[PDB]
Design a protein around this ligand. Structure first.
Ligand code: NHW
Ligand code: X25
Ligand code: CL
Ligand code: MG
Length: 385
């Protein structure tokens, strides 16, 4: 299309394509002293609001906004429905800034109608480790769309990030925008076939009768890696070394400190599940997935799709296929209806064998103020929320 906001930003033009040797900002030698100290102007009747995500009621306001107004399927039957506890987890990572949790209220009602957030993350792109902001949960009320409010929320968080002497960010979206560094399709592994069939997530065809679809997806309730267990605090140094060593092979990944591993992976019910295999006091395999329900739009029988999303999975004692089979099984044991995954890291390699179906669209990865060659999603080693 035209990208009249994006073309004023430091991001590639749609036709830009860079050599592998290119790996730099679009704009360097930036100065915290020069950054605007004034808040970006909102339309008359709207005000900035600083959300405190540790405050139950502020967190609840953001929860309601996203519940009613966040990402939907381009057929409009499902809306992402992140839990309040998930938001807490997602937004209170180590060294997070309260002031990168930005809301917009309509003054006359005092209601939150807009939101955008960022957490700090060390990101390695093509073997350069950069302090970045990981931006997410950009949301404008459905009553207020196409009013050019998103660029205000965007310019306003950029300014707040820049005040911290950070000049780059990472972000993902399903819409195509100038310009992805990688593009990863999503795949779904049915667990509760019948429910999926009933709510129109999956389909039957004459050869695949209901009972055949159910038999197709059925799994044995026995782990390939028998000692896979919920991670605990004692496990963090071992996960740090396992995952950390594994991630170094990729073109794009997060460099986690121990404190970050503890946050990202220590299990929280209905938010984040990590399983580990400990052999001789070493952590040799891990599995992790997060909970992201979709509200079912207008179904007289089901209100919620329980979905597990593949997070970080490493094996040194089994095949990757065996590990991901256990991951599916662990997700089944925790009452999930489906197991989603992106064609990132080694995932694509197992989708056919493990009966994944191809989804409808893809997820684009983006960098802000960074210039580099684009790459296929198997070289992507980071999963955003
Ligand atoms: C160094 C620091 C850097 C910090 C910042 C880095 C950058 C971070 C960037 C943000 C990353 C967030 C990642 C994220 O949270 C994960 S992706 C999910 C985003 N949220 C949703 O989709 C919720 C449902 N939709 C909405 O709330 C609205 O449709 C939104 C608010 C998306 C757009 O509201 P709207 O009412 O429909 O639209 P206008 O206000 O009229 O604005 C139109 C302008 O916004 C551009 N747009 C639309 N969707 C976008 C998107 N998903 N990313 C970036 N840009 C997006 C669009 O191309 C157009 O610019 P253009 O004319 O050039 O085409
Ligand atoms: C986003 C996604 C999908 C997926 N999205 C859709 C369309 C949709 C929209 C709203 C509700 C339900 C469905 N269909 O599938 O599967 C995925 C599998 C893995 C990861 C995905 O994206 C996540 C990381 C980035 N932000 C949100 C979740 C996705
Ligand atoms: Cl401006
Ligand atoms: Mg708008």
């Amino acid at each position: 299309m035209d990208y009249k906001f994006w073309y004023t930003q430091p991001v590639p033009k749609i036709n830009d394509e860079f050599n592998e040797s290119v790996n730099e900002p679009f704009i360097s030698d930036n100065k915290v002293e020069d950054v605007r100290k004034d808040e970006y102007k909102l339309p008359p009747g709207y005000s900035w609001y600083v959300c405190d995500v540790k405050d139950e009621k502020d967190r609840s306001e953001i929860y309601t906004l996203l519940t009613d107004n966040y990402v939907e399927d381009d057929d409009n039957i499902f809306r992402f429905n992140y839990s309040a506890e998930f938001l807490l987890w997602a937004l209170t990572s180590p060294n997070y800034l309260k002031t990168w949790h930005i809301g917009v209220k309509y003054d006359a009602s005092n209601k939150l109608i807009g939101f955008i957030s960022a957490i700090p993350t060390d990101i390695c792109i093509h073997k350069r480790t950069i302090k970045m902001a990981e931006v997410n949960f950009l949301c404008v009320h459905k009553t207020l769309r196409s009013k050019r409010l998103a660029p205000v929320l965007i310019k306003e968080i950029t300014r707040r990030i820049n005040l911290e002497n950070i000049w780059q960010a990472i972000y993902t979206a399903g819409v195509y925008l100038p310009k992805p560094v990688s593009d990863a399709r999503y795949y779904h592994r049915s667990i509760n076939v019948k429910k999926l069939i009933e709510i129109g997530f999956s389909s039957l065809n004459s050869r695949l009768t209901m009972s055949r679809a159910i038999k197709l997806y059925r799994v044995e309730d026995t782990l390939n890696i028998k000692n896979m267990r919920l991670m605990k605090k004692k496990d963090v140094e071992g996960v740090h070394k396992l995952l950390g060593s594994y991630l170094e092979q990729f073109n794009l990944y997060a460099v986690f400190t121990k404190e970050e591993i503890a946050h990202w992976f220590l299990p929280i019910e209905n938010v984040i599940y990590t399983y580990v295999n400990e052999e001789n006091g070493k952590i040799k395999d891990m599995i992790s997935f997060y909970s992201l329900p979709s509200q079912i739009l207008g179904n007289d029988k089901y209100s919620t799709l329980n979905a597990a999303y593949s997070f970080y999975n490493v094996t040194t004692t089994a095949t990757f296929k065996q590990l991901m089979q256990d991951a599916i099984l662990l997700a089944k044991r925790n009452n999930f209806d489906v197991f989603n995954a992106l064609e990132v890291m080694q995932n694509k390699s197992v989708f056919e064998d493990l009966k994944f179906g191809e989804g409808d669209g893809s997820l684009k990865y983006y960098l802000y103020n960074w210039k580099c060659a684009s790459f296929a999603p198997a070289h992507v080693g980071i999963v955003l929320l």
